C-alpha cells in the first residue's frame, strides 16, 4: 500500500546497495535507471499474481445485438473509451476504479438472472467459449442480456508518467521475493561471471521464499466446502 | 629530495604515489558509474594496481 518511491528508496539501501545506479548519498536510484526497475517489478508482480492467486476481481460486460466475441480491453470501458472510435461501450465503470487491463484466468460466469453458464464445455449448448484467453464469446446475444465475470487478475501496470499507477498493493511477506527478482535481473544484466553467481544466488532465494509463502500458507490460498453431492446423488 | 614528496601519507594528493593511485581510482569510478562493474571490482582492482 505504499507508493512507488519507497520501492526506489528500499532498493537503495537494502539490494543493489554497492551498485553505480545509486544516487552518491544512497537515497534514491538515479533517473536515468528506472525504467529498468520499473520493467523488472513489473515482470515481477506478474510473476507472483500468477503464481498466487491473491486478487479476485469482478467485471460486468453487456451484450450488443451484432457482436460475438467480447475481448476484455479497455478501449470498451466506460472511463477509458474514446468515443470517436467505439461508439458504445459494454464494460462497466460507473463506480469506482478504471479496470485496468488484468485479465488472467476466468473461472465463473453469471447470468443477470442469477444462473451460472457453462464455459468451454462442447456438448453443452447453452455454453461459453474462450477463443483467446481474454476473449470471451457467446453466440445467441439477446435483448436485456447482461453477464458478470469473475476472474483471477493480475497488479496493474506502474508507470510513474503522471497518469499512471503509483500504488503497490502486494502482502508483506512477499516484499523480499520482489526485491530478490529484481536483483536478479540487475546481475544477470550485467553479464560478468561474478555477476552471474549473484544472480543466481537470487533467483534461489526467491524461490526458496516462494516454497516457504506455500508450506505456511499465509495467503490462504488453500480452500474447502460443505459437502452438497451427498444429497443430489440421493443418499439418506 | 624528501620523503613528503613522493607520498604524503593522506589519501589526498600531492605526491607521485598518491596521484598514481588517485589516476587509477579516477578511472575504475568511471567505467563504475556506468552500470558496468560493482563496488568488489573495483575494489579488487584497485587493492591490485596498489
Given at each position: 500500500m505504499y507508493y512507488i518511491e519507497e520501492l526506489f528508496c528500499r532498493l537503495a539501501n537494502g539490494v543493489?546497495?554497492?551498485?553505480?545506479?545509486?544516487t552518491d548519498d544512497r537515497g534514491d536510484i538515479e533517473d536515468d535507471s528506472k525504467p529498468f526497475i520499473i520493467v523488472a517489478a513489473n515482470e515481477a508482480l506478474t510473476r507472483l499474481h500468477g503464481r498466487f492467486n491473491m486478487r479476485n476481481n469482478n467485471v460486468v460486460v453487456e451484450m450488443q445485438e451484432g457482436r460475438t466475441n467480447y475481448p476484455?480491453?479497455?478501449?470498451?470501458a466506460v472511463q477509458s473509451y474514446d468515443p470517436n472510435e467505439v461508439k458504445c461501450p459494454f464494460i462497466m465503470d460507473l463506480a469506482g476504479e478504471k479496470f485496468a487491463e488484468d485479465v488472467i484466468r476466468i473461472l465463473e460466469v453469471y447470468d443477470d438472472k442469477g444462473r451460472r453458464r457453462p464455459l468451454?464445455?462442447?456438448?453443452?449448448?447453452?455454453s461459453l467459449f474462450t477463443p483467446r484467453p481474454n476473449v470471451l464469446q457467446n453466440n445467441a446475444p439477446k435483448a436485456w442480456e447482461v453477464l458478470n465475470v469473475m476472474y483471477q487478475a493480475k497488479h496493474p501496470k506502474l508507470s510513474?508518467?503522471?497518469?499512471?499507477?503509483n500504488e503497490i498493493d502486494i502482502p508483506d511477506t512477499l516484499d523480499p521475493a520482489l526485491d530478490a527478482y529484481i536483483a536478479y535481473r540487475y546481475y544477470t544484466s550485467l553479464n560478468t561471471p561474478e555477476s552471474s553467481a549473484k544472480a543466481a544466488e537470487y533467483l534461489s532465494f526467491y524461490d526458496s521464499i516462494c516454497r516457504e509463502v506455500v508450506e505456511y500458507d499465509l495467503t490462504s490460498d488453500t480452500e474447502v466446502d460443505t459437502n452438497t453431492l451427498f444429497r443430489k446423488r440421493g443418499w439418506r | 629530495i624528501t620523503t613528503e614528496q613522493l607520498t604524503?601519507?593522506?589519501?589526498?594528493?600531492?605526491?607521485v604515489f598518491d596521484a598514481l593511485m588517485q589516476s587509477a581510482s579516477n578511472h575504475l569510478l568511471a567505467e563504475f558509474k556506468n552500470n558496468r562493474i560493482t563496488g568488489g571490482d573495483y575494489v579488487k582492482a584497485y587493492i591490485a594496481t596498489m
Open positions: 543493489l546497495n554497492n551498485t553505480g545506479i545509486v476484455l480491453l479497455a478501449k470498451y468451454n464445455d462442447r456438448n453443452n449448448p447453452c510513474t508518467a503522471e497518469d499512471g499507477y | 604524503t601519507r593522506e589519501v589526498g594528493g600531492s605526491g
